Write a protein that binds this DNA or RNA. Structure first.
Ligand SMILES: [Zn+2]
Lengths: 81, 184, 151, 129, 87
RNA sequence: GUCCGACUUUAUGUCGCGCACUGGUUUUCAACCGGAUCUUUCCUUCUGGCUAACCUGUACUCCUUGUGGGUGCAGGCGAACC
């Protein structure tokens, strides 16, 4: 504490702290590639999406707005971007 | 077609580079169909420590998109043709001085033509295949400055030994020393 | 953590990523993105909803990263920027809503105070937009004329 | 509202020194803070600091060595004529043998002795000793 | 401190805290001076030869005396990786 | 170099205060201030003066065969100045 690095703190401590409070502030969110069982189109969605995102081919929602991040639908399969 | 791909007064060394560009143009399916619309702005040579050399091609810059699209392939083929000389695809940008309080009005100098912005763009384009993910500046006790650049661990394999040549190029261009570090 | 018109001290916000340039994984074209922005605006959408749509349904992190211009700037280049800026318009919408609620029931004093707060905020934002000449220098907010702008 | 950023920087330095630490994290990191800390380095009251680019006004990490005992800004940057420099040194510095009134002249931000050497004076920034 | 002739006039140069570089008051009745014995090849504490660290009363009262001693001993090659410079 | 304090009616040889005045001050030194220069690095620039000055080359070389040194006329350096 008396002597301590701030330029290179442990990455565990980096994930520990709040966003806007790291050395350089970087978002904790990320994007996802979701596939709906309907068609083979891959849709790029946001982790903390705010809208009932649907594939352009079919009127099926892939996410759901939530106080925090998106709650995906039942049978859609995603891969982190 | 040596002269067309270079919009500057001829120089014997750069003619060889243009000829190498023609030899690159010899291969059809990927090195053509985009490489025709190419130019130059007096490529220059920077000495590197240990006898190494860094050739720096100077794009006109309204077309850095095409050079960026082509750069990786052109770099490795040119290194194959050009031994011991590392090739760097730098931009050329007009650095303007400030209107001094006693000077006369010219026009609002856009910030993109300023020393700091131009140097940031030069250092960002000193290495295309990687991206700058952090910038640290340490002022030593003795009164000299160092500008650490933190680069992506991903895609570091392209720049394996070009780090020292990058340091030499930046030092020659500016005099502002620089140390490259890759975070874990 | 100021909360100009209340005692709040929050700092809930968004941290713009360090890298200004385009994300590596994005495959869309800047021209296509600008066309999408134009179409969304022609649908009758404010820039904020345009940014939300581009962030959710598509890989657009933010317009300035991909195109190089901001959403309102892109709209203004094509001449779709609304005559009243979006935040001020929403402030007038809220003010007219509270005034409607007041004139439909007099005794509610808390909403009267909230209307005072909203009108103060409207005056501040109007002063700012007037000193930048976005609005004409004769532009003012009046209680009777707010409905026409909202309607 | 952060009005005088240099005030926040020097206050953080003082707090992180009185508690005995060897490092400080100054958030806003303007030019004036950089020049102030550079003068302190030149005279040794500080160690080896560092600018952390944010694209967002940056930040600074300052290394100390306990040699300093107090920074401090004169928040109204009073116009200091070359005659009033001695007055400020008497009122602020603890002894004539050391201490430095860091003041901003038309020739840059300099310690009071250097400004008196150039025979130029301007506004006063702060004091270190 | 130094007379113009170059002769010292100070009564005594005070010790300084080996962890915070702050001087040790004459009546600082909380500060300590630790001695750590030098060790030869076969683990015999060589007598009369050691290394001294003057910890101030301030850090001791604060509660960081042991941490500072950990770091200070690690720097001079006494303890192996007991203290990490990055918390 | 200059020299003066211990040697006392005097000094130098001597004991050096480590030079009481004045220089080499590129002896490395170290600064403490400037000035000009190269950066894609401008300091308001011309328009005639005046061309001050030699990137002028016309007649040419005073003198050791030596660009040290010049008598000098159309281009042509303007911060040396109106
Ligand atoms: Zn489908």
């Amino acid at each position: 504490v008396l002597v301590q690095d701030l330029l290179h703190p442990t990455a565990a401590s980096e994930a520990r702290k709040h966003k806007l409070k790291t050395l350089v502030q970087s978002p904790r969110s990320h994007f996802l590639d979701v596939k709906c069982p309907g068609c083979l189109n891959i849709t790029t969605v946001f982790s903390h999406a705010q809208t009932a995102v649907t594939c352009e081919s079919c009127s099926t929602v892939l996410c759901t707005p939530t106080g925090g991040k998106a709650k995906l639908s039942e049978g859609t399969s995603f891969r982190r971007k | 077609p040596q002269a067309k791909i270079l919009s500057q007064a001829p120089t014997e060394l750069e003619l060889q580079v243009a000829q190498a560009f023609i030899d690159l143009e010899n291969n059809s399916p990927e090195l053509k169909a985009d490489l025709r619309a190419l130019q130059f702005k007096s490529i220059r040579e920077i000495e590197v420590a240990g006898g190494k050399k860094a050739l720096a091609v100077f794009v006109p810059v309204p077309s850095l998109a095409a050079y960026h699209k082509v750069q990786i392939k052109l770099t490795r083929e040119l290194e194959k043709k050009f031994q011991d000389r590392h090739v760097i695809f730098l931009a050329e940008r007009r650095i303007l001085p400030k209107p001094s309080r006693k000077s006369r009005q010219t026009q609002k100098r856009p910030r993109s033509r300023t020393l700091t912005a131009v140097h940031d763009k030069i250092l960002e384009d000193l290495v295309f295949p990687t991206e700058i993910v952090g910038k640290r500046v340490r002022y030593l006790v003795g009164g000299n400055k160092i500008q650490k650049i933190l680069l992506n661990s991903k895609d570091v394999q392209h720049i394996d030994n070009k780090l020292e040549s990058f340091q030499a190029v930046y030092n020659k261009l500016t005099g502002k020393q620089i140390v490259f570090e890759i975070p874990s | 953590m100021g909360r100009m018109h209340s005692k709040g001290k929050g700092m809930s916000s968004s941290a713009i990523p360090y890298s200004r340039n385009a994300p590596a994984w994005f495959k869309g074209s800047s021209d296509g993105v600008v066309e999408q922005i134009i179409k969304y605006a022609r649908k009758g959408l404010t820039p904020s909803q345009i940014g939300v749509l581009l962030r959710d349904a598509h890989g657009v992190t933010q317009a300035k990263v991909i195109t190089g211009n901001k959403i309102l700037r892109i709209l203004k280049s094509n001449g779709l920027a609304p005559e009243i800026p979006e935040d001020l318009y929403f402030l007038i919408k809220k003010a007219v809503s509270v005034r409607k609620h007041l004139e439909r029931n007099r005794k509610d004093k808390d909403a009267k105070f909230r209307l005072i707060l909203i009108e103060s905020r409207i005056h501040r934002l109007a002063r700012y937009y007037r000193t930048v000449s976005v609005l004409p220098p004769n532009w003012k907010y009046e209680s009777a004329t707010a409905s026409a702008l909202v309607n | 509202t952060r009005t005088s950023v240099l005030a926040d920087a020097l206050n953080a330095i003082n707090n992180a020194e009185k508690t005995g630490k060897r490092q400080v994290l100054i958030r806003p990191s303007s030019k004036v803070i950089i020049k102030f800390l550079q003068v302190m380095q030149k005279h040794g009251y500080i160690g080896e600091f560092e600018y952390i680019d944010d694209h967002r006004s940056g930040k600074i990490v300052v290394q100390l060595n306990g040699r300093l005992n107090k920074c401090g800004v004169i928040s109204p940057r009073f116009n200091v004529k070359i005659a009033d420099v001695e007055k400020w040194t008497a009122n602020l510095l603890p002894a004539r043998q050391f201490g430095y009134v860091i003041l901003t002249t038309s020739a840059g931000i300099m310690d009071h002795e250097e400004a008196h050497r150039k025979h130029v004076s301007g506004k006063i920034l702060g004091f270190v000793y | 401190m130094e007379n113009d002739k170059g002769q010292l006039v100070e009564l005594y140069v005070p010790r300084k805290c080996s962890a915070t570089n702050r001087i040790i008051k004459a009546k600082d009745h909380s500060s300590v001076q630790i001695n750590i014995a030098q060790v030869d090849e076969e683990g015999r504490a060589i007598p009369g030869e050691y290394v001294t660290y003057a910890l101030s009363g301030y850090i001791r009262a604060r509660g960081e005396a042991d941490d500072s001693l950990n770091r200070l001993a690690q720097q001079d090659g006494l303890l192996k990786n007991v203290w990490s410079y990055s918390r």
